[PDB]
Amino acid sequence: MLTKFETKSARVKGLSFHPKRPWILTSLHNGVIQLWDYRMCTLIDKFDEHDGPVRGIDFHKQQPLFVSGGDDYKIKVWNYKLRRCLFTLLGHLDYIRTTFFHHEYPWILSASDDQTIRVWNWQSRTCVCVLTGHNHYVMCAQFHPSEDLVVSASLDQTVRVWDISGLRKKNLSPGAVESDVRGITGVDLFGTTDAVVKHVLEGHDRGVNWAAFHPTMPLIVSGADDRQVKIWRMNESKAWEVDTCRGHYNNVSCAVFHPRQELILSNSEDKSIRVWDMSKRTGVQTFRRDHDRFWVLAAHPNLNLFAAGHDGGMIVFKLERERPAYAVHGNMLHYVKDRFLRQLDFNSSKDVAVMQLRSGSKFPVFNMSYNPAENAVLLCTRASNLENSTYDLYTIPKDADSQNPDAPEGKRSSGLTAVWVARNRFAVLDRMHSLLIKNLKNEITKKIQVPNCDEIFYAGTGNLLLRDADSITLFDVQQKRTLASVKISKVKYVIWSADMSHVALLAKHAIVICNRKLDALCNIHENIRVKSGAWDESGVFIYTTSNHIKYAVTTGDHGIIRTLDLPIYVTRVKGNNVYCLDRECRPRVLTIDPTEFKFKLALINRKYDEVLHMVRNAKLVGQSIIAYLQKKGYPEVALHFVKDEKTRFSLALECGNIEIALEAAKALDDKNCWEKLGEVALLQGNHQIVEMCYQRTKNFDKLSFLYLITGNLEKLRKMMKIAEIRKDMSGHYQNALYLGDVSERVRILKNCGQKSLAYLSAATHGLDEEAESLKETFDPEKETIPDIDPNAKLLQPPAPIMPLDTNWPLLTV
Amino acid sequence: MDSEPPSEISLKNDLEKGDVKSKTEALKKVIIMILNGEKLPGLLMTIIRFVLPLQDHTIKKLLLVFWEIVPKTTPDGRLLHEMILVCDAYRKDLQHPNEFIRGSTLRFLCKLKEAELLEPLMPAIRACLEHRHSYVRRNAVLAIYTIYRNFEHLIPDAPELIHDFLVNEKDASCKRNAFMMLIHADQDRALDYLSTCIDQVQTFGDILQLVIVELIYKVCHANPSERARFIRCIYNLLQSSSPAVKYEAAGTLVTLSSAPTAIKAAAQCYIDLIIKESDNNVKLIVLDRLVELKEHPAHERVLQDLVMDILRVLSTPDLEVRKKTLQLALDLVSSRNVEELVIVLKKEVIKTNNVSEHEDTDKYRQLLVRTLHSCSVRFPDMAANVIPVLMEFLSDSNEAAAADVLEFVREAIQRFDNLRMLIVEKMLEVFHAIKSVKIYRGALWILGEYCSTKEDIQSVMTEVRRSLGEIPIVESEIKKEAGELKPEEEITVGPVQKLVTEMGTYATQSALSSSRPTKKEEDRPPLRGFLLDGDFFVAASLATTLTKIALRYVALVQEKKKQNSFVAEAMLLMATILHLGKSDPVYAEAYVHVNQYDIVLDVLVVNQTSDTLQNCTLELATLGDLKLVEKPSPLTLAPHDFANIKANVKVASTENGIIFGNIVYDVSGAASDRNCVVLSDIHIDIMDYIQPATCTDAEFRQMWAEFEWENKVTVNTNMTDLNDYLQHILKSTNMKCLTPEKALSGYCGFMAANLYARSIFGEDALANVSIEKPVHQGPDAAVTGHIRIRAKSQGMALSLGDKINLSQKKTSL
Amino acid sequence: MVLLAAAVCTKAGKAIVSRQFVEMTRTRIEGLLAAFPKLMNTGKQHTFVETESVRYVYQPMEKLYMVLITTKNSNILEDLETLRLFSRVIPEYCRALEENEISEHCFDLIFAFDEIVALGYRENVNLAQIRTFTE
C-alpha cells in the first residue's frame, strides 16, 4: 500500500469518490466539506455548509457539480467551478447520512437518519418519490453504475434495495395479481411496511451502517455496528451466498469492495482498518494507522485508487502499478496490467479510453513478452520464482487464453517463465530457474522443453528473457550462455523498437536506440532523457518527452508532429501511426503526417517551388520556414525567405553584394547597418555605394580619408565641407592635403580659430598670402620654423587615374 | 473599508439614502477601493445624482476627487459628452462665491489631459482668476500650464482669459506670492519676469522660479531656495581637488548616514584629507589642498598634531571610526605607511610598559609582533627601532609572551643578517619558564643563529631541553636552527660544536648534550630530520649550511606585499580581509524564433478534428520565474483550423502560485469540464528559475568555508577549457565562470573557475570546474573535468553537476 | 509630474489611502507602498531613502508610514516641505496615523493630496484652507 494522499481535516463522516475524475469529497463533523484533486494536490473547494456534522457527501457529475447532505436536514448542491450554491432542497427532517444523485433528470436522493430515503425533483415543483421501509436509520445509500437501482444500508438490521424511478421498490407477481408484500406468514415472515417488495436483503449484524459494491459485480459487502462484515447478493436475496468476515473489534462503520484487488477492504470505529480475503471471507490482516476510528469508506467507481475516511482526516491510497512494460503491434497495444482493467487503442487528446481486444495480459503477469516477428505473446502465469508455473501464449492481433484448445495456437504448458527471443519464433525459458531453450519444432514455440541449463541469473520478465541479480541480462536463443549484460541509468523503463530482438536504453541525454546484444545504432537528439520513444524499426523515430509527440527525426527532417492534452509514453511505432499509453494507461494515437516532414524533405533536395505549397500553418512556426531559410553562406535557402528586414540584411553580406543590404539596412531604420554594409561594399570593390552609405551614417571624415585613396577629387571636396561644420579635424583637414593645393584647410581652420595651423598649411603650398590673412586676422608671427616646414613646397599631383575607384570595375558573380 | 473589492452593491444603497453623511461615506468608500485598484462603475448614476449643482462643498469635493483618478473608465452615469457629468453643473461649481468649491473644481478640471473635457477646463481658469489666497493664485498658474499641456500648445491656451490663460506665470513674479508653472514651453515674457522676481521673491515661489532659471551674479539675495542653488554655483567657481572644505553641502550630508558611527568615520576622513596633500604613496593618500591647515610648524600653538594623535587608534573611539582612523594616521604622515605604522604598532604590540596593550592570547600578540617587524622589512630605518621594542615585548616574561615575540624576531633576522646580533642575549632570558611550543621554537632559532655573538648557549638551552611544555613544532624549528654561525665562538660547558651535536639530536638523532633535548620526533609528517642532519657540512658556519639559510631570506622579502610582512597594523587588517567586495482536443507544434531581436515561442494550433472547439481562446501562462510578454491572441482552434499564433516569452519574473513545470500553454474551447486544457510546446527547464550572480575570489573563498562543496561528479565533455562548452551550458543553468582557484605550472594547470549564482530557490549555487587536461604523465582520467559543486543545501549543486556536459535543442518544421 | 504619488501607508503591506494626480499609479501605488514602507521605506531612520529606483521620503507614525514618493526632483527643500505640510494636515483629519481611522477618512486625505500636490508640483496647504473644501 502506498499513500498517494493524506490530508488531516478532522473527523470525516462522509467520503465519496468522483466517478468522472480521480477526485475525493469528504464531509466533516466540523461542518466543512472539501473537494480535493488528490492526484494533483490542489484544493478544488471548501464549504462550511452547516454548523455541526455533515455526514453525507456525493458527486453529482452529470453536469459538473457536487452534492452534499448535512444535518441541516437538507441536500444541497454545489458548484465546484464557480463556488456558489446551485440549489437547495429539503431532504428530510433528520441527519442526511449519505446522499446519492440520479442521472435521470437533476433529481437528488438523500438517505437520512429519520428512517426514509427520498428522491426530490428540482427541475420541476414535484417531489417525485419517497422510498420507505426502515424502522431505524438509513445510514447509507449507494449507487451501482446503473442508475435504476440503489442499495441502502440501515440499522434496523436490513439492506433495502430500491428503485428511484419507482415509488418505493418495483415488482409485480406474474403468477398472481396480488402485491408481493405479505404482512402474514407465507413462505417468509415480515410485516406490511412497503408498497411491494423487489428485494429485501439481510443486513443483520445489529444493523448495517454502510453497503457498497465491487464495480463489475452485483455482490455487496456491508459493515455494521458489531464487529463483523457480511457479504450479500443484492440480486437475489440469497442466504446461501452470505459469508461473514470476522476480524474487527468494535462497530464496523463500513465495508466496501476494493475494485482493483480480490480482497474486500473494511474499516471500523475501533482504531483499525482491516483487510479481508474475498475468496475466503475472513481476515487476512489488520492494519492500525492510529488516526483512531473510521466512520466512512469509499471504493472508486472510476477504478483509480481506494480511500477510507478516519477521525483525523482521510487517506487515498494506492495499490496500483507504475511504468508497465508494453509493445505495440499494428493497431494493438499490449501492456502489463494496470487499474481500470484492460483498455487501449483509439483517441488522440482525450483522457477517455475505449476497449479493443489486444490483451497481452489476461492473467497475473509473471512475464508479458512479444514474439520478435510480432505474431505471439507470451504471458507467464501462476506467479512464482521457484521452478515452475504455467505459461499461456496468445495470438497477437486478438488475444484469448486459448484460441481453440483443438488448434496449436493459444496452447499452454509449464515453465516458470518463458520469454520470446530472436530467430523470430523462438523462446527461451526457465523451468528449473536456469536458462533452458524452447522449441516446439516449427511456428511460434509453445511447448516446454527441459534440456540446456545454466547456473547464472534468475527468472523474471523481459522480451529477450530479462533476468537480474545485479544487471539486466539478455540471454541467448539456443545457448545457456549470457548473450550480453547491460548496465546503465534508467527512468524505470525498457524500450523496444517493436520487434523484440532490439532494445532502446535510456542514457544521460535522451535515449539510445540499439540492436540485439548492446550495440548503439544512434542517439536521439534532445537535451533531457525522454520518457519513452520508439523507432518505427529504424528511421522515423517518434517520441514523447512532455505532453507532445514529436519526431526526433524522419529523413533528416525535424518536427514536432502534434501535442496531446495529457503526459504520455509512446507504446511504440509499428506502422505510420505511433501509439501511446500513460501510467493510468489511457491511449493516444497519432498519424505521422506529411506536414513538417514533407517541407524539409523538399528543402534538403533543394526545392523551393515544392516547399511554397508545403508552407501551411500547422508547421509555419517562425524559423523553419520564414527565417530558417536565411541560413546559407552562398544564399539558396536565403533567397527564398527574405521577408524580414533583418533576414534581407543578412542575405546581402552572405552574397557580398550589399545593394540589397542598404535597403534592408534602411528598413531596419538604422545607421549601423549602413556603415557595416558600406564597409562590405568597399570589400566588393566600388566606392560609390560606400559613399552613399557612409554619408548617411555621417562618416564624412572616413570618406575624406577614403577619397584620395579612391582617386576622386570632386567627391573628396563634398566631404570636406560637411565635416568642416563638425570640426572633425581628421575629416575636413584631410582633403586639402589630398588635392594639390591646400586652401580647403585654411578656411576650415580659420573657422576653428586655429590660425597657426591654417597659416602653416597654406604657407607651405606657397599660399603665403592666405597664410598671412590668417596671421593678420588673428595673432601674427609667421616667421618661426617648426619641427615641420612652414613654407616648403606642398604640391602633390592629385590622382593620376582618370577613372576612379568609385568606378572600380566589377562584374559580380 | 481598507480594501474590500466586493462591496459595490452596498455602496449603491449607501450612496443615496436621504442622509448626507451616508452619501459622503459611500462616495469615500468608492475612492478608497479605486485607489487600491478595485471595482467602481456599477454605482455611477447614484453617485452623480445628489451632488451635481450644489455649492455644498464636501460632496462636491468628493465627487471632484473621483474625477482625476478614474473619470474616463466609469461610464454608467456619465457616458461620453463634451459637458459630461464631471462638468456641466460644475460650471456652477467654478462660478460659486465660495472660493473652495470653485477652486477645487478648477483644479481637477484643468488637471486632466482629457479631450472630452478640454472645452470645459478652458474657461475653468475663471474660478481662480480672482485670487483669494496664495493657493488660488498658485492653483491658477499650475492649471493654465496643465491646460497648455492638454492639447493647447497654440492659441487655446497662451494669452489671458480675463487675467490668466498662461499669464498667472507673468503675474505671479510681480504679485505678492510666486509660483511659476512655466518650467518648460511657456511664455518668454514670464521667464524674463521671473528673473526680476529673484529680487522681489516669495520663498516657496523662489524654488519654482529657480528650477526654471538658475545662476546668480551675486552672493545670494536671501531665502533657503537661493541658498541651495548657490552651493551648486560655488562648486563651479572652484571644482579643483574636490570641494576640499565642504560648502553648504555639510547640512544635508550628516543625515545621509544617521546610523551613527559612520558619520564620524566619514567626517574624520574629510578632516584628515583637508589637513594636507602629502606624497600619496601606499596608504599616504591625503588629497584636497596642500596648505590650508598645514602640517607642522614649531611655533604653532597648541599644534596640528593633537588632532593627528586621534587618528592613531587602538580603538579609542569605536570600531567603525577606528578602522577609518588607523588608515587616516597612515594617510597624513608617513614615509609611505611604514613610518606611522611603526609608531602606531609600537602602541598596539605587546609590552611590559603598559598592560593595556599586552594580552595572554597568543595569536593576536604574535600578529602584533609581525606587524611591527614588517615595517623594518619594508623600510630600513624601522629595523633599528623595531629590535629594541621587540626586546621590551619579550620582557613580559610569560612563557607565551616571550614566545610570540621570539617567533617574528627570528624571521626578521633571516631578512636582517648579522644586524640583530645584539638581541640574542635578551631573547634567551625568557625561554626557561615555558609551557608552550612557540617559545622554544623562536628562542632556539635566535640563540642558534646568533651563536658567534654570545657564548651562553649550553646554559640557556639546557634548562629548556630538560623542561617540558608542548614540543611538536619545536623540533622543526630547532632542527634547521641550533648550530649556526661561526664554528667555535661559544662555550659555557658546551661550545658551538656541542650545539651541532644537540641540533642533530633534537632533529631526529640521539646524543648527550644540553642534558638531552625535550623531544626528537619532528612536527608534521613531511618535514623530518634528515635534510639538516646531512647538512652542517661545515660545522655551524656561514658557508653553505643552516647558517646560510638562517642568514638568508626565502625568495624576495620587501615592502608590505606580505613577503616577510603583514600588511599594515594587525587589527585594521581584519576588517579589510572581511570585505569581500562582492559585485477539448488540441494539437500544438512549436519552435522558438528570433527576428529583429524579438524572442518568441512560435506555436501553431491545430484542430485535426471535425468536432466543434469554438469558444477557442489561447493563453501563455506565468508559472514562476517564466512569464508571457504577450500570450498568443487569436481566437483560433476552430473545426479544421491550422493557425500560426505567436506567444512572446520572458525568462525572468516572480513566482506565481500555479505549477512550476516546463512551460504551461493553455488553449480553451468547447467543453464544460475541461473548458481549459494544458498542452505543451517544446522544453524549458527548472534551471531558468536560478538567478545568475557572480563572485570574486574572496566571496568564493568565504562561501567555500561557509558551507561544504565536497560533492563532486566528473562530467564528460569538460575536455574543453572553462571558456567554451562549459561557460555556455553553465550560463543556461544561470551560472557564470568567474575567478580562479588554480596554481598552474609544468605539473599543475587544471583550469579552475569559481562559480556563483544566487538562485531563486533559497540557495546560492557555487562550483569549481576543474578541467583535468593533462599537464602530467599521469592525468586523472585524461581530458574531462571534475566539477566540485555546492549550493547552500546542495539542492542546486546537482544542476551545476550535470548542466556542464551537453545541451542542445533544434527542430525544422 | 515630478511627484508620482503622495501616499499614506500602513506597513500592514498595503497603501491605506493614496493619491494618483493623473491616471498612472492605480494598483502600482499599493505594491510600492506595501513592500517598501514595511522596512521603514528601507530606511535606517533617515527621512530620504531611495529603493527600486524610486525616492521615498517618509516619517513613521505608529505601524504607519506617511510617504511621499518621487523619482525625479527639483529641489532639496521642497520634497520635505510638502510632506511636512501634509503632516500638519493629516492629524486634523485622522488624529495621528492609524489604519482604520485613515481608512475612514479616505476622502479627507485624498482631497488634501490633490490640493497639496497638483499634477506632481508641490502646492501649499494649511488646516484653515482645507476647511472651505470639506465644508
Curated annotation (Swiss-Prot), chain A:
Task of the protein: The coatomer is a cytosolic protein complex that binds to dilysine motifs and reversibly associates with Golgi non-clathrin-coated vesicles, which further mediate biosynthetic protein transport from the ER, via the Golgi up to the trans Golgi network. Coatomer complex is required for budding from Golgi membranes, and is essential for the retrograde Golgi-to-ER transport of dilysine-tagged proteins. Xenin stimulates exocrine pancreatic secretion. It inhibits pentagastrin-stimulated secretion of acid, to induce exocrine pancreatic secretion and to affect small and large intestinal motility. In the gut, xenin interacts with the neurotensin receptor.
Species for this entry: Mus musculus (Mouse)
Disulphide-bridged cysteine pairs: none
Keyword terms, alphabetized: Cytoplasm, Cytoplasmic vesicle, ER-Golgi transport, Golgi apparatus, Hormone, Membrane, Methylation, Phosphoprotein, Protein transport, Repeat, Secreted, Transport, WD repeat
Residues modified as Phosphoserine: S173, S402
Full protein segment contained here: 1 to 813 of 1224
GO MF assignments: hormone activity; mRNA binding; structural molecule activity
Repeat positions for WD: 7-37, 49-79, 91-121, 133-163, 203-233, 247-277
Lineage: superkingdom: Eukaryota
Cellular compartments per GO CC: axon; COPI vesicle coat; COPI-coated vesicle; cytoplasm; extracellular space; Golgi apparatus; Golgi membrane; growth cone
Residues annotated with Phosphothreonine modification: T185, T591
Chief place where the protein resides: cytoplasm
Gene designation per UniProt: Copa
Name used for this protein in its record: Coatomer subunit alpha
Topology term for the membrane: Peripheral membrane protein
Cell location: Cytoplasm; Golgi apparatus membrane; Cytoplasmic vesicle, COPI-coated vesicle membrane
Complexes and interactors: Oligomeric complex that consists of at least the alpha, beta, beta', gamma, delta, epsilon and zeta subunits. Interacts with SCYL1. Interacts with JAGN1. Interacts with TMEM41B. Interacts with SVEP1. Probably interacts with PEX11A.
One annotated GO biological process: protein localization to cell leading edge
Source lineage: Eukaryota, Metazoa, Chordata, Craniata, Vertebrata
UniProtKB/Swiss-Prot annotation, chain B:
Domain of life from the UniProt record: Eukaryota
Location within or outside the cell: Cytoplasm; Golgi apparatus membrane; Cytoplasmic vesicle, COPI-coated vesicle membrane; Cell membrane
An example Gene Ontology CC term for this record: Golgi membrane
HEAT repeats: 81-116, 117-153, 225-261, 262-299, 301-338, 381-418
Species this chain originates from: Mus musculus (Mouse)
Subunit structure: Oligomeric complex that consists of at least the alpha, beta, beta', gamma, delta, epsilon and zeta subunits. Interacts with CAPN8. Interacts with SCYL1 and PRKCE. Interacts with COPG1. Interacts with ARF1 (myristoylated); this interaction is required for binding of COPB1 to Golgi membranes. Interacts (via trunk domain) with ARF1 (via switch I region); the interaction is direct. Interacts with KCNK2 (via N-terminus); this interaction increases the channel-mediated whole cell currents and promotes plasma membrane expression of KCNK2. Interacts with STX17. Interacts with TMEM115.
Pfam families membership: Adaptin_N, Coatamer_beta_C, Coatomer_b_Cpla
Function: The coatomer is a cytosolic protein complex that binds to dilysine motifs and reversibly associates with Golgi non-clathrin-coated vesicles, which further mediate biosynthetic protein transport from the ER, via the Golgi up to the trans Golgi network. Coatomer complex is required for budding from Golgi membranes, and is essential for the retrograde Golgi-to-ER transport of dilysine-tagged proteins.
Modified how: Proteolytically cleaved between Ser-513 and Ser-514 by CAPN8.
Keywords of the record: Acetylation, Cell membrane, Cytoplasm, Cytoplasmic vesicle, ER-Golgi transport, Golgi apparatus, Membrane, Protein transport, Repeat, Transport
Note: Brefeldin A induces dissociation from the Golgi of the beta-COP and presumably the other coatomer subunits.
InterPro entries listed in its UniProt record: ARM-like, ARM-type_fold, Clathrin/coatomer_adapt-like_N, Coatomer_bsu_C, COPB1, COPB1_appendage_platform_dom
Modified residues (N6-acetyllysine): K479
Main location: cytoplasm
Cysteines paired by S-S bonds: none
Gene: Copb1
From Swiss-Prot, chain C:
Family: Belongs to the adaptor complexes medium subunit family. Delta-COP subfamily.
Biological process, per Gene Ontology: adult locomotory behavior; cerebellar Purkinje cell layer maturation; establishment of localization in cell; Golgi vesicle transport; pigmentation; protein transport; retrograde vesicle-mediated transport, Golgi to endoplasmic reticulum
UniProt-annotated location(s): Cytoplasm; Golgi apparatus membrane; Cytoplasmic vesicle, COPI-coated vesicle membrane
Cytoplasm is among the record's keywords: yes
Role: The coatomer is a cytosolic protein complex that binds to dilysine motifs and reversibly associates with Golgi non-clathrin-coated vesicles, which further mediate biosynthetic protein transport from the ER, via the Golgi up to the trans Golgi network. Coatomer complex is required for budding from Golgi membranes, and is essential for the retrograde Golgi-to-ER transport of dilysine-tagged proteins.
Name of the protein described by the UniProt record: Coatomer subunit delta
Any Gene Ontology CC annotation: COPI-coated vesicle
Coiled-coil portions: none
Species, as recorded: Mus musculus (Mouse)
Domain of life: Eukaryota
Disulfide bridges in this chain: none
Swiss-Prot/TrEMBL keywords: Acetylation, Cytoplasm, Cytoplasmic vesicle, ER-Golgi transport, Golgi apparatus, Membrane, Phosphoprotein, Protein transport, Transport
Record's subunit section: Oligomeric complex that consists of at least the alpha, beta, beta', gamma, delta, epsilon and zeta subunits.
Organism lineage: Eukaryota, Metazoa, Chordata, Craniata, Vertebrata
Keyword Membrane: yes
Primary subcellular site in the record, as a coarse category: cytoplasm
